[PDB]
């Protein structure tokens, strides 16, 4: 089970911003496989007050991205996208539903994944103007506060958007690096979550971090593909990474 | 959204085991309303070495139960059941945002709920003979260890059974008393969770508690009703309550 998240090395004001593209099992960065490079055909983007700008894939591994010019103190976003892919799917094999699950009617599903990282370059920077504005991700977690102001046990309010509208009753979960230490040699074991809750009518939910560290929140939404004459289903997996304390 | 859980008072060897059927929103115990009495037509049960025995409904409120005899030191189970109720649902057009809508047709759904509490009577009591054996709940969480042996940040392994068989890929969440405290009655939603994961092929999952206190783990499963000539769907909500630290 491969998922997209974003990681940023701690930067000092006036340096190049370094980010990593998060493709696999969090939090272990892995090189993008040869048979998967077409999926990440567009580079990771840095969002500042000037807007969005692309980043340059350079480093010892092909998941490392750098800003072209250094960054001044502030609170910025780093965004990655799994470009839409298409796959065939059947349905069968449930515990006690029924053996004949619409007996092999195959359908098309479009998979899209997104990742957003809140990066505070200045160690004193906790601004909200940039990080609280949506960047247009089909499924998006928009922070309503800066993580630098959230202590352990406090509430970090985020909003879930699907196709530009708030998504109510959406399950958003959260984990951190070091919570679950079990190997990726047990079949496709997606990591345990240290938090889970559903969004309200405004698409908002308070993440309550019980530990400090590098946190990843995530939400997935499966829906009908807009143009049914091309494809039937659409799956979206979105993550938001941030530092607590 | 009323759910079923079980609470037990701290018990020493030689006194009666006092327990509480919680029907509503964890962790607030409430009296079973007049129109809900038929649902809990059977008393809560105490499970010990000699097996399952009925508890006696004594107390100021109708959710309070007492063991028939004073209990000795050990590790026992207290089980409660929301008996099967039938209702009509039609999904005529409802509730939002991702798929088109509406295969308009009314159907029967059976609802059953279960709660189980691991009660360690007497300090140093951390036995596993009784609490690790299934009791026959249609959807059941069976602990594979005694929670007394589990410290904060460690792994408490449980197994999920549906109709006597392990249930893979089932979502088990976990929260504790005091994790989320607000919202008198506005929308009376389901509260935030401090843990969430999915069961493996053996139906097993490790709960990782980050805080001491009174914990509730929850799992739900919706499937087809066995005899389709009488009813179509079955919804099961199951809870396991335990102390950590």
From TrEMBL, chains A, B:
The keyword Signal applies. It comes from the Bacteria. Keywords: Signal. It holds the Pfam family DUF4198. The keyword Signal applies. This is Phosphoribosylglycinamide formyltransferase. It comes from Neisseria gonorrhoeae (strain ATCC 700825 / FA 1090).
């Amino acid at each position: 089970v491969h998922r997209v998240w974003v990681e940023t090395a701690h930067t000092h004001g006036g340096e190049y911003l370094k980010a990593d593209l998060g493709y696999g099992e969090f939090p272990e960065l892995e090189p993008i496989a040869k048979d998967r490079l077409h999926i990440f055909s567009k580079p990771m983007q840095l969002v500042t007050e000037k807007g969005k700008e692309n980043m340059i894939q350079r480093g010892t591994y092909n998941y490392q991205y750098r800003s072209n010019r250094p960054v001044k103190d502030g609170s910025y976003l780093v965004t990655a996208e799994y470009q839409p892919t298409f796959r065939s799917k059947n349905k069968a094999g449930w515990k006690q539903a029924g053996i004949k699950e619409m007996p092999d009617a195959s359908y098309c599903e479009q998979t899209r994944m997104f990742g957003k990282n809140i990066v505070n370059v200045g160690h004193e920077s906790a601004d909200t103007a940039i990080i609280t504005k949506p960047v247009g991700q089909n499924l998006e977690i928009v922070p309503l506060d800066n993580p630098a102001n959230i202590h352990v046990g406090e509430r970090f309010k985020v909003r879930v958007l699907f196709r530009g509208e708030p998504l109510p009753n959406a399950t958003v979960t959260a984990t951190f690096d070091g919570f679950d230490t079990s190997d990726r040699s047990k079949t496709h074991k997606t990591e345990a979550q240290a938090f889970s809750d559903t969004t309200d009518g405004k698409g908002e939910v308070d993440i309550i971090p019980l530990r400090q560290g590098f946190w990843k929140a995530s939400v997935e939404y499966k829906a009908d593909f807009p143009d049914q004459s091309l494809c039937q289903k659409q799956a979206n997996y979105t993550t938001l990474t941030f530092q607590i304390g």
